[PDB]
């Protein structure tokens, strides 16, 4: 079970956000079709991190953050009616976003289809 991310109920998310499908993205900085995550301020699709053990991504939505600040992202293919899986990079966790529904109706996502 996870906490409530701080900036859950008063994230700012950008005006003017793209329509996200329900599959087929990828990275915009390389050519990872799998373990991305969409940052909930700017709607962009970027890959996972490198772990310590080699297994992951290419570091782009982490690179992404350090240089908007923009703290959660969720990871696609994670959605269903039940939750998802969000990220939060300022609290280094896996957290619960209460306000979900709503932050992800801004990218035309239905989780509760
Ligand atoms: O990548 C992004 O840009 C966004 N997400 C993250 O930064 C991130 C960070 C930590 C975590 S974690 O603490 O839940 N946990 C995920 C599984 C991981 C692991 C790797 C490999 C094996 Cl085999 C077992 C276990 C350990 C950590 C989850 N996501
Ligand atoms: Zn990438």
């Known amino acids: ?5 701080k900036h859950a109920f008063s ?7 793209a329509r996200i499908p329900p599959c087929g993205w990828k990275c915009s900085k390389c050519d990872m079709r799998e373990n991305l995550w969409l940052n ?3 709607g ?3 890959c996972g991190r490198r772990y ?3 297994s992951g991504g290419n570091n782009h939505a982490v690179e992404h953050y350090r240089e908007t600040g923009y703290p959660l992202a ?4 994670t959605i269903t009616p039940d939750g998802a899986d969000v990220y939060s990079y300022d609290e280094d966790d896996m957290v619960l976003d209460p306000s979900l ?3 992800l109706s801004h990218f ?6």
Do not use: C, W, Y
């Not at 035309?108 to 289809?113: E, P, S, V």
């Open 40 to 42: 909930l301020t700017d």
């Open 1 to 5: 079970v996870r906490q409530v991310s």
């Open 44 to 46: 962009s699709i970027l």
């Open 74 to 77: 969720v990871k696609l293919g």
């Open 52 to 54: 310590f053990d080699g």
């Open 108 to 113: 035309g996502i239905d989780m509760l289809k």
């Open 101 to 103: 529904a709503e932050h």
């Open 11 to 17: 994230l700012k998310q950008l005006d003017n956000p």
